[PDB]
Design an enzyme around this catalytic site. Structure first.
Site, PDB file in Angstrom:
ATOM      1  N   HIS A 257      -6.594   4.093  -6.164  1.00 43.32           N
ATOM      2  CA  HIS A 257      -6.498   2.648  -6.463  1.00 43.32           C
ATOM      3  C   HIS A 257      -7.735   2.209  -7.225  1.00 43.32           C
ATOM      4  CE1 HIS A 257      -4.317   2.078  -2.347  1.00 43.32           C
ATOM      5  NE2 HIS A 257      -3.457   2.557  -3.260  1.00 43.32           N
TER       6      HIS A 257
ATOM      7  N   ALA B 237      -1.570  10.036  -6.484  1.00 41.83           N
ATOM      8  CA  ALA B 237      -0.557   9.167  -5.912  1.00 41.83           C
ATOM      9  C   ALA B 237      -1.019   7.714  -5.979  1.00 41.83           C
ATOM     10  CB  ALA B 237      -0.202   9.600  -4.478  1.00 41.83           C
TER      11      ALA B 237
HETATM   12  S1  ICS Z   1      -0.179  -0.652  -2.810  1.00 38.13           S
HETATM   13 FE1  ICS Z   1      -0.456   0.805  -1.112  1.00 38.13          FE
HETATM   14  S2  ICS Z   1       1.469   3.577   1.427  1.00 38.13           S
HETATM   15 FE2  ICS Z   1      -0.827  -1.835  -0.990  1.00 38.13          FE
HETATM   16  S3  ICS Z   1      -0.730   2.939  -1.599  1.00 38.13           S
HETATM   17 FE3  ICS Z   1       1.196   2.718  -0.618  1.00 38.13          FE
HETATM   18  S4  ICS Z   1       3.694  -0.633  -2.175  1.00 38.13           S
HETATM   19 FE4  ICS Z   1       2.106   1.400   1.471  1.00 38.13          FE
HETATM   20  S5  ICS Z   1       1.204  -0.010   2.990  1.00 38.13           S
HETATM   21 MO1  ICS Z   1       3.569   3.431   0.388  1.00 38.13          MO
HETATM   22  S6  ICS Z   1      -1.718  -0.266   0.429  1.00 38.13           S
HETATM   23 FE5  ICS Z   1       1.615  -0.853  -1.426  1.00 38.13          FE
HETATM   24  C1  ICS Z   1       1.353   0.737  -0.269  1.00 38.13           C
HETATM   25 FE6  ICS Z   1       0.486  -0.580   0.946  1.00 38.13          FE
HETATM   26  S7  ICS Z   1       2.979   3.105  -1.881  1.00 38.13           S
HETATM   27 FE7  ICS Z   1       3.216   1.102  -0.892  1.00 38.13          FE
HETATM   28  S8  ICS Z   1       4.310   1.291   1.030  1.00 38.13           S
HETATM   29  S9  ICS Z   1       1.120  -2.550  -0.026  1.00 38.13           S
END
Ligand code: ICS
Ligand code: ICS
Ligand SMILES: [Ca+2]
Ligand SMILES: [Ca+2]
Ligand SMILES: [Mg+2]
Ligand SMILES: [Mg+2]
Lengths: 522, 477, 522, 477
Positions: free
Chosen positions: B192, B62
């Site tokens: 990531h 993911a």
């Molecule tokens: S990439 Fe991360 S879980 Fe930084 S995996 Fe997730 S589109 Fe969240 S809080 Mo879904 S670290 Fe982005 C996120 Fe934040 S998918 Fe999105 S909203 S700002």
């Protein structure tokens, strides 16, 4: 910019001139994009028969599948049992996805746990994850049963579920008599429907294999009903309604309708309704067992016939007129209850609606997809309506099933221009709807992208989507609908004819051009 | 609630657990003290999830496929393994883009190797090579391929790096092997990092010996904005109104060429620290490009950020900064005037991934709201360090919250609104608590920038103040 | 020309070049048609505020009414009684139209007779037509009751129904004991709903006025339900289902659900179901009488209160959440029955759906029309959904009703931009949807022509129609739907949200233009 | 069935009736003998309906407004009286046209004076004058107005002729008063006659002194084709392929100017004899224009008609006639080859208005079908004279059939298909008898001409042979 009285979300905000200019600058400066003429050329090529031939030669690549993986179906099966927690042994990422997938279709909570195996478990397996997982789940979420399936990590490492559960009980992590049925559900075999079959047969074995000596076929005067993987609430409901109206004693084995439709009244109910453990233990005492979706209940069938000794009837899914008639007649024979006046009248109301709508349905051409039983029932009903089901796609279908559908097509003149495809995906279907264009598609939300592609070729090439199947994520509350029985046939008919009439109204709305045929009465 | 009441709540909730789980979970739950600077004194994070407790977390695939790579629009991303992962993640995340899907852009499609038993038993590397040839035939305008490994790939000993090297050379194509199997790490987070290292190793250096790009002193890249509902576009517009040239967006609406051009920029602007700090550090090390964190949620943060960014450039950019701020002043002031009186004093609990649980606090405060609890699925302690100063004293912090914990905390705290994800939404609505999705924006947005603030405010108001919420109790009960 | 394997009907046949050329030649040669620039100019003018102001100044001309005439409603009322033949004293042309109108909405037979008065009857009246008509109808069609209404010719000439029926019995044309209730139903007063009220009050009088001495309020322990003019089968059905679930004794007075839904099983059934004569005779013994559509049941109310001595409760139509709650609570109070768990759960499922769909409904603007009770219930539910009912049109509404709707609009912030119009028609509404454009219309099939007009101005000006009301002639089987109760609210909500999402999908389907927002999940 | 069996069926059915009705109805039911020329020896017609028997007939307003005037596209037709007539007849009849509705054409709109009590008590002539002014303001491109009287108008003594004269003079507008109140006559028929006389008296003579029209030897008018589903267009095309010039269509797709130009033609081609023989006779008397009956239902009749029409002109038209016939030969032959084997021997009963009950028989016969019963709502004896030779010996004829009779006849005769109207359709479908609407074409058509025959054949087959008809009997019964 925004005007506070009429705020714009992404659509249509990004159509403002400043955004348009910015996006043009981004493209031209930094994206090294293929020229538009080249994009157009390639798009056109992807609509051709030449491209279709290449597309159908694929052996290794899948694009836009129309199936999911086994444990998704095990989870849905498990949800249908009273106070039961679905538990997937293996990797937690899978569970986040299963929950989210069902959340988006049902617009409901979907409870399921993982035992969060990590890389370290590759050295000697997930036994400790099972022990702590079962103990933690029981304590925290207070289920009365935990139904265990697997992710592909656990299958590849080779974890023995039976041994691991047995050791969890031996070492005191969960009580000896606490029910922990299980099934191996490898995602690299079959599809989500196979995981449902596997889970169900595992639950059935758990409650009955060792206790068969006191069982007597017919002694409880009920008929067992096994629904299979089912994502329309109305389908569970219509079956129960029809059996009740006939005065037929029954047990619906796996019944998630309550837990997928709890009220918003100020409290969250993690569990609601469901098949009881008493019903599963007593199931061998039924007169017989009817499988609503036999083409994904083959393992279950072998167990019910071999162990319960039930003579499971050869019935198709009860979809459309003829197959609902056959279902009710067989239930009548098994139970000794006559088909009542209420159901006879309902049947005749469906027939009336067929007579009323037949002129708009006649000869209409459809592409369609979904799971095997759903697809063949839809095909059968389309033939009953005088429609032509020209492209029939079942990604997770098998050769035997395809032979059966080819036989159904043979029994009707409306099947003459139809072909059944197995193992093919929605990128294959996309080609078919360009090269042999139907009037409509009947499918799940992934079809919207095919409709988009067809419109891009031109309005005259657009194939509108009619949403019937799973998942449906871009409309609200369609999961409440019905596709089984006379009620489901009425709903399907109504949806089809009004989709035809909506499209005809669109095509005839043009002032002084096509509105000579924009009739008030149709 | 007082510090003492919150501590009591934590202990009461933890009573349900067996001892091992109780002892672990206690370390992941804290009462905030903005006076603390070292969060490792206060809370543990980035550890394994306890089995059976209904974590909200996902996996490394993911974090790599779903989050970092998937948005890159002119590449084809192969979900390599069995059919589920790629299907569940198909078009779930609203990482917006401009393109002709199926022709020059591929974001919402699901390309997969659909592993079967023979692929597990004998390996998938031959299948992968054939798949790449089929991709090339059927999608000739793709500008590169990534291979996003699902759980089985490393478990069975496949060598996707060899396949990527051999096929990439044969086709003169960038083919990126990504070892993001979900068995790695503990959450999306390691995905990531894996994904960043794959960009470093296979893409980012491509133009290291090319001198043809014409640079300017005002060239920047937006690092870590995935353009949810258009968020990156409503950020970009402001940066360019301020006189900057946004060479790249990582990775919302992103193209492979803009990634390859990023080493030519003067400054990397990091929105999502969690997901892209790794590559930002690499670019400073290798190319000398500085990076800085910023925040485009709400007017206060956006204005602060614009000024801090402009301060890195000359007086001409600082003058344009003040012009941008003056232009949008009446717009966001009108939003506040309309919506703040509708929202003032209302209390919110958040639970999100790795950034937004702290980053959105200022925007809530610009509407007079108070964030009384927050937490993250997969943040690290450096995230918590940045959080404790943004949250009020005696507020509740939760790392990798369990389903049980979140429900019990909500029952006690009784927030007016919850902001979390899809697996949470329908639970809290049944409880009669207004809920906004703070990943997908509930199919709305953008929320970044001045234009996004308007939509954020409209959305918080439409939901918190909706007539439905007065209707859950039947009048006969 | 035609190609035999793909025959073209009018659409698209007349788009063939030879037909297009022929039609151009017809126009140019013989039609003396206004130039297209002039047509365009006038069309544009008809979309303006200046035109709207002239349009709203009409005093004598009506264009595109949203009502019909009294006897239509009398016929529908009469159809709801067991083995009852509707009989309209006067002109036969009227009966051909009433039958056809209902035929097209229900897609069912509609039985009704005339006594075929001709010009000769202007010299001394229709008495002989009544005598022979009653005798002929009874002999031929074997009804157990004939319910008599009037056409406008009979009203203008002044025929005394009571005297004529009495003389028909005196002179042996029909038996003295044969029930022949009647009502004067002048088409130049009120509308179809008034005819329903008049007919019902006439039937109620016939069976009860002279037999009041032995009646005791409450002695039969039932509640009478009077539905009014109702053209959704699901509405009769939902009220019966809810009362039955609650264990409430009831009598539905005028119940055409069976005769408007007979099965297609090989025989035509002229009559089916219906309220019995025994139910009408016993009605004064009920606890009370509830009027489902009080704004067209005022004459009935005066009779039930004045003669039966029932204290008719002040209840709105049971539409939406609050008014369904109020209906059930009042029925509980009258009957002594508690509201059952099933209905509490159903309510909470509606509330859950509201929570699920509120973000797409919020702030959506609607124009709508129909009969007064339907319109006010739709307005109320829209406000509950956070929608704005901006143009509220009720051609057959009155000043007192408008005051009541204005008060409902005052009780919600969602009513701030709404106006209620009475006496205005669909040509008035057309102007409103141009000058103060809403997102959608909710109305009957005559709205399709407004949508066509709006599209002609441009796609961005198009106001799509959502079909709810009467008549619906251009879609099939919508008459089976429900608008009352929690079930009807769930149906309406689903229809509205999915209409919003269908339009958004249309607007975002453009490849590389607007499809950045063509989301899989909504 | 034998003549004697049909006679006994009639007598059996009539046993239900009281004596007065029985004696009347006996005169309206007959067993055909194609050997009779004088139908007044065998059937009575065009008499009042018996009260209470459920006639299928309409009224004079239907015949005038609904049938003759309503289709004229560039005029506004006022339904003058209370609201019902105009609402029930709004867009019920598929008289197709090309125009811009609400702007230059008005066919599917309902203009009404919506009479209220004060209009009945004090009269409607003042209201009508005001209404006319409102029409002129709001619909400036209308090319004339008609006033279609509903029942109350003559009963209350209104003077719509005076209003029409005074307002027509004031506004320099053709305003046509039509006294088609439904109390007049016995059926739609007298409305046709009233409507024809109104065209004669108020419209047709306008250009009597105008010689500017560029006439040719090949000018014709199509008289009595209301363009149901485009029927007149699919007729016109053939006449013009044959070298004729169709100056007017009365009244489907018709304009006021084409009506006014009709006295300039060389030949009037009468399709619907019943509705327009009156004006055809007038035009022969006043202008010397001959008229002839024709039939464009099915290939046999269409070919015969084309030849008979062409015979009225010169050799050039006769040559083009044979060219048209040759062009379409393979097209209708292909329709026959596909559909006749699907329909051969099937038996049909018809019940329609004034023309089609005889006119469509040839088209059925072109598909091998047999019309075993037919009848009319409102035909006169001259219609029955034309029917007896078209129908087989010993077939059943019914004039102004009652609902009871039609059902009982159908139960005995057991036709394979019924062709009738909307009030009949749903009855017979429940009985398991395939039904086609033979007024509205069941929202299909055209049925006239060669192009229409293809659609006719398709439609008869789709319905007669539909799979639904085998499903009415439950398999447990
Ligand atoms: S990439 Fe991360 S879980 Fe930084 S995996 Fe997730 S589109 Fe969240 S809080 Mo879904 S670290 Fe982005 C996120 Fe934040 S998918 Fe999105 S909203 S700002
Ligand atoms: S006008 Fe007449 S009833 Fe000749 S009133 Fe009627 S569109 Fe019929 S059999 Mo409807 S004399 Fe036309 C008719 Fe025939 S409306 Fe049409 S189908 S050919
Ligand atoms: Ca829900
Ligand atoms: Ca019907
Ligand atoms: Mg069509
Ligand atoms: Mg065409």
């Amino acid at each position: 910019s925004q005007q506070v009285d009429k705020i714009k979300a992404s659509y249509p905000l990004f159509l403002d001139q400043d955004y348009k200019d910015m996006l043009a600058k981004k493209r031209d400066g930094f994206e090294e994009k293929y020229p538009q003429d080249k994009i157009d050329e390639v798009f056109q090529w992807t609509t051709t028969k030449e491209y279709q031939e290449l597309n159908f030669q694929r052996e290794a690549l899948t694009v836009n599948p129309a199936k999911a993986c086994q444990p998704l179906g095990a989870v849905l099966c498990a949800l249908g049992f009273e106070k039961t927690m679905p538990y997937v042994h293996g990797s937690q990422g899978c569970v986040a996805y299963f929950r989210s997938y069902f959340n988006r279709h049902f617009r409901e909570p979907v409870s399921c746990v993982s035992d969060s195996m990590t890389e370290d478990a590759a050295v000697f397996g997930g036994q400790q994850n099972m022990k702590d997982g079962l103990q933690n789940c029981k304590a925290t979420y207070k289920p009365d049963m935990i139904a265990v399936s697997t992710t592909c990590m656990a299958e590849v490492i080779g974890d023995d579920l039976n041994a691991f559960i047995n050791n969890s009980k031996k070492e005191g992590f969960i009580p000896d008599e606490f029910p922990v049925p299980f099934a191996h559900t490898p995602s690299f075999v079959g599809s989500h429907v196979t995981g449902w079959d596997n889970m169900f047969e595992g639950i059935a074995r758990y409650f009955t294999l060792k206790s068969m000596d006191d069982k007597v076929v017919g002694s409880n005067k009920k008929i067992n009903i096994v629904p299979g993987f089912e994502t329309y609430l109305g389908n569970f409901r219509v079956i129960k309604r029809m059996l009740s109206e006939m005065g037929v004693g029954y047990s619906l084995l796996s019944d998630p309708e309550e837990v997928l439709d709890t009220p918003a009244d100020g409290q969250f109910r993690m569990y609601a309704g469901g098949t009881t453990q008493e019903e599963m233990k007593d199931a061998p005492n039924a007169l017989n067992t009817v499988l609503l979706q036999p083409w994904h209940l083959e393992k279950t069938k072998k167990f019910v016939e071999g162990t319960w000794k039930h003579e499971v009837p050869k019935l198709n899914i009860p979809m459309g007129l003829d197959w609902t008639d056959e279902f009710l007649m067989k239930v009548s024979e098994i139970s000794g209850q006559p088909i009542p006046a209420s159901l006879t009248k309902e049947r005749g109301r469906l027939v009336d609606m067929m007579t009323d709508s037949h002129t708009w349905l006649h000869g209409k051409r459809f592409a369609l997809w979904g799971d095997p039983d759903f697809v063949m029932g839809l095909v059968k009903f389309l033939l009953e309506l005088g429609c032509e089901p020209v492209h029939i796609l079942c990604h997770n279908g098998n050769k035997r099933w395809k032979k059966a559908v080819d036989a159904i097509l043979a029994a009707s003149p409306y099947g003459k221009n139809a072909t059944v495809y197995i193992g093919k995906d929605l990128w294959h279907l996309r080609s078919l709807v360009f090269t042999d264009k139907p009037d409509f598609m009947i499918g799940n939300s992934y079809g919207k992208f095919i409709q988009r592609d067809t419109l891009h070729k031109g309005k005259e090439f657009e194939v509108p989507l009619i949403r019937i199947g799973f998942p449906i994520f871009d409309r609200h509350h369609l999961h409440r609908s019905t596709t089984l029985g006379y009620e489901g046939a009425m709903q399907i008919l109504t949806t089809l004819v009004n989709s035809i009439l909506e499209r005809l109204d669109e095509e005839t709305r043009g002032m002084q051009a096509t509105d000579y045929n924009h009739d008030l009465v149709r | 609630m007082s510090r003492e009441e919150v501590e009591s709540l934590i202990q009461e909730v933890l009573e349900v657990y067996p001892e091992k789980a109780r002892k672990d979970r206690n370390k992941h739950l804290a009462v905030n003290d903005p006076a603390v600077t070292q969060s490792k004194k206060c809370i543990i994070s980035n550890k394994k999830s306890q089995p059976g407790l209904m974590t909200i977390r996902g996996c490394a695939y993911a974090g790599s496929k779903g989050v970092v790579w998937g948005p890159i629009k002119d590449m084809i991303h192969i979900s390599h393994g069995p059919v589920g992962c790629g299907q569940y993640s198909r078009a779930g995340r609203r990482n917006y883009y401009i393109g002709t899907t199926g022709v020059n852009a591929f974001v919402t499609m699901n390309f997969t190797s659909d592993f079967q038993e023979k692929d597990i038993v004998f390996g998938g590397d031959k299948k992968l090579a054939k798949l790449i040839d089929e991709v090339e035939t059927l999608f000739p305008l793709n500008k590169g391929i990534s291979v996003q490994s699902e759980c089985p790939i490393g478990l069975i000993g496949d060598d996707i790096e060899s396949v990527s090297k051999v096929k990439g050379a044969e086709l003169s194509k960038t083919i990126v092997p990504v070892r993001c199997e979900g068995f790695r790490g503990v959450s999306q987070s390691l995905g990531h990092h894996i994904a960043n290292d794959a960009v470093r190793d296979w893409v980012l250096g491509k133009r290291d010996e090319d001198t043809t790009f014409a640079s300017t002193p005002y060239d920047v890249a937006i690092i870590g904005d995935y353009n949810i509902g258009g968020d990156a576009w409503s950020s970009r517009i402001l940066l360019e109104e301020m006189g900057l040239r946004c060479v790249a967006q990582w990775s919302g609406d992103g193209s492979i060429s803009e990634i390859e051009l990023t080493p030519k920029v003067k400054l990397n602007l990091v929105h999502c620290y969690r997901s892209m700090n790794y590559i930002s550090r690499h670019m400073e090390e290798k190319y000398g490009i500085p990076w800085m964190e910023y925040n485009f949620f709400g007017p206060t943060k956006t204005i602060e950020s614009l000024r801090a960014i402009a301060a890195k450039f000359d007086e001409s950019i600082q003058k344009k900064c003040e012009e941008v701020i003056a232009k949008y002043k009446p717009e966001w002031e009108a939003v506040v005037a309309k919506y703040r009186p509708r929202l003032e004093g209302k209390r919110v609990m958040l639970y999100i991934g790795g950034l937004r649980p702290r980053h959105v606090i200022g925007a809530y405060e610009d509407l007079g709201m108070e964030v009384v609890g927050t937490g993250y699925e997969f943040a690290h302690n450096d995230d918590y360090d940045r959080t404790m100063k943004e949250m009020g004293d005696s507020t509740l912090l939760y790392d990798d919250v369990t389903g049980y914990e979140f429900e019990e905390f909500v029952k006690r705290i009784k927030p007016d609104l919850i902001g979390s994800g899809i697996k949470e939404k329908f639970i809290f609505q049944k409880m009669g608590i207004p809920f906004r999705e703070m990943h997908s924006w509930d199919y709305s947005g953008p929320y970044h920038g001045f234009d996004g603030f308007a939509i954020f405010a409209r959305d918080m108001d439409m939901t918190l103040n909706n007539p439905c919420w007065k209707k859950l109790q039947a009048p006969w009960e």
